[PDB]
Amino acid sequence: RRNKMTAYITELSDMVPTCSRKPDKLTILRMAVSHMKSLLTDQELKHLILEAADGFLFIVSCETGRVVYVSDSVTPVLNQPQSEWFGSTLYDQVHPDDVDKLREQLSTSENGSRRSFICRMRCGEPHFVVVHCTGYIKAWFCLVAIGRLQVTPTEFISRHNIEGIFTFVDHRCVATVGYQPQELLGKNIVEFCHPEDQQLLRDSFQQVVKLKGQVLSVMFRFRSKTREWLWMRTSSFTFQNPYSDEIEYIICTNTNV
């Protein structure tokens, strides 16, 4: 108790050189008083928000979407000048497919209220970043908000049932094997394998299910749309539902070799 108080007074004195023969307790109390009198404003809070979540404040009009205030922070989050944002509407700074959603969030027909949504805003052939906007409405009708950026071939991956049927295949297949994804789905992978290698493939599948979780590996000749035998390495592991441990499917990464 008394030790905590002494450590408190000392750590107070610790960081302040002005008072640091260390004096009477009352004098360091009035000392901290006088040092604080020389000294929480908004610019530090702005930098705290920009540090924590890379966010910037903006006030727009609820009716015409013309922004009435953008903070400087708009420049590091979107590489967009302040002069751009000021004098325009949010509809111009938002992905065209996102205007209707904007329209509702800026609507005053439904409801001091609070807003929270996601959209895509263009940054400095265009490019859009996902921005989470949280804010409320203010008569000034206007929307006060903070928009923040969270921001946190030679192969193709496929999903299979434990039998070996393609239940999922990514587009990269068309470049590696030459098939459109539709010609692979619903068919067993051993259908596309050289018969001489087929058994091997099947064995590997039996092994990925017996040895759950562990990634297994097999190399075989895959038939392409051009009917050429292409050697390929497939690394396969079963994926389990993290709650029930049920095998959802088997993930394979088929890599040209």
CB 117 within 8 A of CB 142: no
Maximum C-alpha span of the chain = 93
Tokens 């992978």 belong to residue: 189
Distance of alpha carbon 52 from alpha carbon 46, whole angstroms: 10
Quick note: the x/- pattern for another protein over 119-138, rule CB under 8 A, is: -x---------x---xxx--
Q: Is the dihedral of CA 210, 215, 216, 220 positive or negative?
A: positive
CB 9 within 8 A of CB 32: no
User: Cβ 199 to another protein, closest distance in Å?
Assistant: 26
Q: Quick one: which segment of 75-83, 142-150, 201-209, 211-219 binds another protein (CB under 8 A)? A: 142-150
User: Cβ 254 to another protein, closest distance in Å?
Assistant: 12
Other beta carbons less than 10 A from residue 60's beta carbon: 26
Total interface residues for another protein by CB under 8 A: 79
Candidate list 144, 200, 219, 230; residue touching another protein; CB under 8 A: 144
Give residues 61-100 in contact with another protein (rule: CB under 8 A). 97, 100
User: Cβ 134 to another protein, closest distance in Å?
Assistant: 4
Cross-strand bridge partners of residue 114: 136
Contacts of 8 (CB under 8 A, 6+ apart): none
Alpha helices, DSSP H, located in 97-178: 99-105, 173-176
Give residues 162-221 in contact with another protein (rule: CB under 8 A). 165-171, 181-182, 185-186
Distance of alpha carbon 65 from alpha carbon 220, whole angstroms: 60
> In terms of CB distance, is 65 or 135 closer to another protein?
135
Q: What is the DSSP letter of 201?
A: H
**Contacts by 164-173, CB closer than 8 A, 24 or more apart:** 164/188, 164/189, 164/190, 164/201, 164/202, 164/205, 165/189, 167/249, 168/249, 173/254
> In terms of CB distance, is 197 or 250 closer to another protein?
250
> In terms of CB distance, is 169 or 197 closer to another protein?
169
Candidate list 83, 154, 226, 241; residue touching another protein; CB under 8 A: 241
Give residues 5-44 in contact with another protein (rule: CB under 8 A). 5, 8-9, 11-12, 15-16, 25-26, 29-30, 32-33, 36-37, 39-44
Candidate list 19, 59, 200, 219; residue touching another protein; CB under 8 A: 59
Q: Establish if 139 lies at the interface with another protein (CB under 8 A).
A: no
> In terms of CB distance, is 156 or 197 closer to another protein?
156
User: Cβ 194 to another protein, closest distance in Å?
Assistant: 25
Candidate list 146, 177, 201, 218; residue touching another protein; CB under 8 A: 146
